[PDB]
Design a protein around this ligand. Structure first.
Ligand SMILES: CC(=O)N[C@@H]1[C@@H](O)[C@H](O)[C@@H](CO)O[C@H]1O
Ligand SMILES: *[C@@H]1O[C@H](CO)[C@@H](O)[C@H](O)[C@H]1NC(C)=O
Ligand SMILES: *[C@@H]1O[C@H](CO)[C@@H](O)[C@H](O)[C@H]1NC(C)=O
Ligand SMILES: *[C@@H]1O[C@H](CO)[C@@H](O)[C@H](O)[C@H]1NC(C)=O
Ligand SMILES: *[C@@H]1O[C@H](CO)[C@@H](O)[C@H](O)[C@H]1NC(C)=O
Lengths: 325, 121, 168, 168, 325, 168, 121, 121
């Protein structure tokens, strides 16, 4: 802003503008390397690396998977009947019981992530002539080798498996989710010895819809000494409807309904531990601050989170054009 | 971190000449002005002169014509005073100070001072 | 829609301004100086904050979404999820890049000119005293002191246009 | 890219927008008055109607789509259908809010200034008797009647300068 | 630009900007029929009509589909063990020998398209007591009627079909895609006489998952004198995981495994022949040069292609506004 | 934000400027020539090239996608795939039409004015000799030859005041 | 709904003074001009004067100097006339009318009118 | 294609008058100027005048005042040459040339020429 010199009669008042000696390079619609005085980094480049559960109700998942948290996971029975707003599943993911294989595992994971409120109301039933509370061999709880706490391992009683015809009406105001299963033995001799005679048949039907399954028999690869699989099913019941567990063979019946609420809940496969902060946006890397419009941390989010973009350094021109000399 | 580095003490003849220095760092030289403030021992601070580092515009205090002379070196980011016809009344501590542009002149960053003593001893 | 001042005839500007975003210098007989504007800098900061209201905060609380990472390969249901998430990410990244481009351009465009208010304010008293100056370096031929510059910055300036000894 | 007239030096404006958007106001010995620039208001209404031609009518005629209103939960695909419908609306709502913001900003920008046509028309007739003025009103020294202002409105003006006085 | 008189009292000048008398109509946000000096056609209106394959290794068509090549089409033996970055499927392509009916055909098509790397490692197995290397009648291969080359036809041997229990673990460090099938005959007498006794029962289980299928016996309409169908299944195996083919009846077994890696390949359905260019964007109408942001050629693309839009004449104002007259 | 020059007071324009986008047409006693300001047309060509760097070349290497061409109907997942592909195409076609509209509008808006530099350059030697010309041809009363137009092109113009004509 | 409400009928002595009223409503007062039109019984309409409600700019008819005086009250949105040196020739019906700005002056909304009678009876 | 089609050869009396033609095509006539170049056989090229197709600006060579004149017809895109007071020295080939605007004057497109011969035989 060159000013001529000491002038008396005139006054050269170079009414100019403001400059900053340091500059920040931002992108415009014309030039990709323009420089501005100040710039706000819109994309959250990095996290604090930690999950902080103070604003939300983040439930830890150390040696826990959510579908086994629904089940009787012996390493995860300390999280039973626990509310959560965000379940984090640890990358170690060590499940130590019979190998469950939900045929629509992603669907059940997304369903209970959407519900997010674990209230297992232990419901009485009409199982007559069965052997409830079976003994597993890979669930490790109290050195007793019990089954899942929440699923009942119904087998023969007095060498007889009657055709079960149990029901429990929905006489309440909320939905009742029934998490049941069907067992896939290694051999036909195993099914004959354990559950019933010859094959098995299950027809689980609500009033409005039905779900039937035939168990499969075959020699699976052994996981922790089990040549078998258990496949888990879900039977959402609307108010006023009737749930009717009609099974003849490999029934793994629920001990009670799971209360579901269409609430602010989700799941997130992560590895960072639980800490203490004030931030409501959580990422598998860790809880990031919410004061950014975009991010580059990860795709998977929960809560009031910035939107994921593929860029890394979108800086908003939070000032005028820099001409720092 | 902004700091106005300052030289050591000098002890010269009465009537001789001395050239002080004040190397500015941490900020762009031509933006903020440079001001020098004289403080006698036990007396009040006294404002010497004011200089523009961009193009060497100088205004001097009315008591300080021919005694103080202000120059800058824009390459090394430093400012100098030249003293002429020194007397024992000039023995003081000279602080080089930064400043806002022009007549507003609030000296946001100060200097450490220079003990200048004028004596024949 | 550039106005060509800050990259135009305001060649570098001066960095000893910590009092705002826009400036007013002078070369009065009682020493030079500078002072920042009150309402124009506040207007620029206010529109920046208005931009940041829909950017900082007001993030949509998307609680439960689809799984965006996969370990095994499943086929038709899986690559459809990958396709919809990738198209959402590409659309939102293009939206973010485009948004940054448009409003960085708009921030450069609006933080430009608005000298015209000072031009018209000085104009009527700078019509007969050796005419005018059009740059950002106004040769205000009104021989006036720091109080005159206070009136210039203070938007309350009476027009004592200087009669004789003008235009040679 | 604001021009600083409507919120700038048009401090009040008058409220007879019954024949046009833009106006022509005057002071006279033979009474004041008001008109409307048919060219400028017709231009502005033309850009407004061109903006509305992509918007008002000519909607995308999409007949059959996926089911959006849902029921008791199914698990997979329904979650994907809700996710793709949510993101579709989320992108379209951001796109509608962005479109409203850009077109309202652009409407305020295009319905701004254009005194420069009248300024350059009047510069020749005020370059020698008095000078111009831009603070609010637009002072014109050419002493004439309603026909001269009509010629100003007609964009057919002959630049007849009174050379009797220079600036006083 | 009307310039003043020559004399001009010898004291004058002037200024202007621009013109060119050509004219090009583009669309803006205000008007839809504004005219500019120059304009770049942003939408690729037309192709060159031929698939030219210099940047991407594009494998040929010639009456054989990708699933035909994966099944080892007897019409196309010259495509085995052939790497490819882009597959083009001819519109004149037809199946041969047995009509395969993959129950999730688009899923397998997309899976092997994303694979894009054919190396059928001819893995040795333990097929004992079966009549492998079976011969069909609708196959044509040197007028010898030889079955699928990339997988094996297994029937009874010495009027006996033992319950096969083979396994081959993943001792390597890459995923091994296994392509197997189950045979759906045209008669119960055909099932009894040809494969095994009575019905069949097939379960193919990995460590991490399981796939099972019961063969179906029907009377499907004849294609090339074949009143039968086969259905093809895939059993992706992670490193360390162990595959176990378990079958009792109809086993259309692999002869090895298909190597799969997370490449950048894709399938494409087209009819254009093979040529030479330097163009990395391919479309079913033929390769277009991707020096444009958008296109209106086709929806399906491969590689670095412009994004498909429903417009046809999006012209950017590369120049500025034209005032030609 | 239109500036009203290319459609305004530059009403016809001359068609011979093949070397540059802009120019400085003139009329002298020794011949009415032409010009081409390389700085302004170079800035315009550079911003067009910067616009086309995000557009012409450097696309997104999307290799494997979902199947868009379809056949006889299969299920609801085919309807979902068609719906997501159609919504992607509609979003991208709206987005490309919007991008063309904003960038064509911005190209028209920036390739407009920036002739105020010539105004302010010519002012201080045009302010005295028969005052101020701005109607589109700078009726410069500095009696000079092609050297002065060369200096105006070179942006190296001094101010030799023409006091022979002060008012008329 | 815009309507220019007026007062009732009034009777004065010859030479007395009367002040009429016309309360504008339904629209902002300072926008449109206020005009008064007098209709003599069985005669033609006559235009009295014009007033700017924004800043009280008044132009009067050439036959009405010193006889009609136009004032406004911007708080209550009303307009007044002052009458001086009244005579029996002045007995008529006075209509207050709105108007477009200035010389164009088309009276878009009219008033009901007030009968003014000047007599000694 | 930009081609300046030109007429054939002529033969007239010394002191007579002739009118030449040059039909412009393929480009807008008012854009670029017209210039005419005379070449006597065995001699050098000579520049005689320039015209502006937009508004008929006339600039002639100093040696050819009153002898060569320039006219255009904007309707037919034609440039005309009228010659007066012909002498035996005038026999040459007259080239119709295009021209860039003004004093830059680079003739981007040329013509074919007409054999103009002046003789009494
Ligand atoms: C820290 C910093 O920006 N230093 C700059 C340097 O980049 C530049 O090259 C040099 C040119 O004089 O001026 C100084
Ligand atoms: C359970 O988790 C803890 C850490 O949370 C870990 O140290 C331990 O090894 C886990 N249990 C098993 C059986 O791996
Ligand atoms: C449950 O049902 C069985 C048979 O359906 C019945 O014998 C039994 O009494 C029922 N339970 C109770 C608590 O009544
Ligand atoms: C089975 O176990 C549950 C608790 O897990 C208990 O309440 C129930 O009485 C048991 N039933 C039998 C038959 O042991
Ligand atoms: C400056 O303006 C303020 C209000 O804007 C007011 O005090 C006065 O007009 C001015 N003050 C001085 C000290 O001139």
């Amino acid at each position: 802003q060159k000013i001529p010199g000491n002038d008396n009669s005139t006054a050269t008042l170079c009414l100019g503008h403001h400059a900053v000696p340091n500059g920040t390079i931002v992108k415009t619609i014309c030039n990709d390397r323009i420089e501005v005085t100040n710039a706000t980094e819109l994309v959250q480049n990095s996290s604090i690396g930690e999950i902080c559960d103070s604003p939300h109700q983040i439930l830890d998942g150390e040696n826990c998977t959510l579908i086994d948290a629904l089940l009787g996971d012996p390493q995860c029975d300390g999280f039973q009947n626990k509310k959560w707003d965000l379940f984090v599943e640890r990358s170690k993911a060590y499940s130590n019981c019979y190998p469950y294989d939900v045929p629509d595992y992603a669907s059940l994971r997304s369903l209970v992530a959407s519900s997010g409120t674990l209230e297992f109301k232990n419901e009485s039933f009409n199982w007559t002539g069965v052997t409830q509370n079976g003994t597993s061999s890979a669930c490790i709880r109290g050195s007793s080798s019990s089954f899942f706490s929440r699923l009942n391992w119904l087998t023969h009683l007095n060498y007889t498996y009657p055709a079960l015809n149990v029901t429990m009406p929905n006489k309440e105001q909320f939905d009742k989710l029934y998490i049941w299963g069907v067992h896939h033995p290694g051999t036909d001799k195993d099914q004959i010895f354990l559950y019933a005679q010859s094959s098995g048949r299950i027809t689980v039907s609500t009033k409005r819809s039905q779900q039937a399954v035939i168990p499969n028999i075959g020699s699976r690869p052994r996981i922790r000494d089990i040549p078998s699989r258990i496949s888990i099913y879900w039977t959402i019941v609307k108010p006023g409807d009737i749930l009717l567990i009609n099974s003849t063979g490999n029934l793994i019946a629920p001990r009670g309904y799971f209360k579901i609420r269409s609430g602010k809940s989700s799941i997130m496969r992560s590895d960072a531990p639980i800490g203490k902060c004030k931030s409501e946006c959580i990422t598998p890397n860790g809880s990031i601050p919410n004061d950014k419009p975009f991010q580059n941390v990860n795709r998977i989010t929960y809560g009031a989170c910035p939107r994921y973009v593929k860029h890394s350094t979108l800086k908003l021109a939070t000032g005028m054009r820099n001409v720092p000399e | 971190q902004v700091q106005l580095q300052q030289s050591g003490a000098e002890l010269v003849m009465p009537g001789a000449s001395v050239k002080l220095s004040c190397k500015a760092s941490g900020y762009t030289f031509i933006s903020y002005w440079m001001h020098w403030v004289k403080q006698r021992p036990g007396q009040g601070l006294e404002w010497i002169g004011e200089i523009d580092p961009s193009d060497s515009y100088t205004n001097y205090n009315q008591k300080f014509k021919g005694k103080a002379r202000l120059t800058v070196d824009k390459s090394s980011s430093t400012a100098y005073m030249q003293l002429s016809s020194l007397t024992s009344e000039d023995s003081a501590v000279y602080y080089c100070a930064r400043g806002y542009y022009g007549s507003s002149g609030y000296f946001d960053v100060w200097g450490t001072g220079t003990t200048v003593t004028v004596s024949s001893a | 829609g550039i106005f060509g001042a800050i990259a135009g005839f305001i060649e570098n500007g001066w960095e000893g301004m910590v009092d705002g975003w826009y400036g007013f210098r002078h070369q009065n007989s009682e020493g030079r100086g500078q002072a920042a504007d009150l309402k124009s800098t506040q207007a620029a900061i206010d529109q920046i904050n208005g931009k940041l209201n829909r950017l900082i905060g007001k993030t949509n609380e998307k609680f439960h979404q689809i799984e965006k990472e996969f370990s095994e390969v499943e086929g038709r249901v899986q690559d459809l999820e990958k396709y919809v998430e990738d198209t959402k990410i590409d659309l939102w990244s293009y939206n973010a890049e485009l948004l940054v481009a448009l409003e960085n351009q708009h921030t450069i465009d609006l933080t430009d000119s608005e000298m015209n208010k000072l031009f018209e304010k000085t104009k009527k008293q700078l019509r007969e005293n050796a005419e005018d100056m059009g740059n950002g370096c106004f040769k205000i031929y009104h021989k006036c002191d720091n109080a005159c510059i206070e009136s210039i910055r203070n938007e309350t300036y009476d027009h004592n246009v200087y009669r004789d000894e003008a235009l040679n």
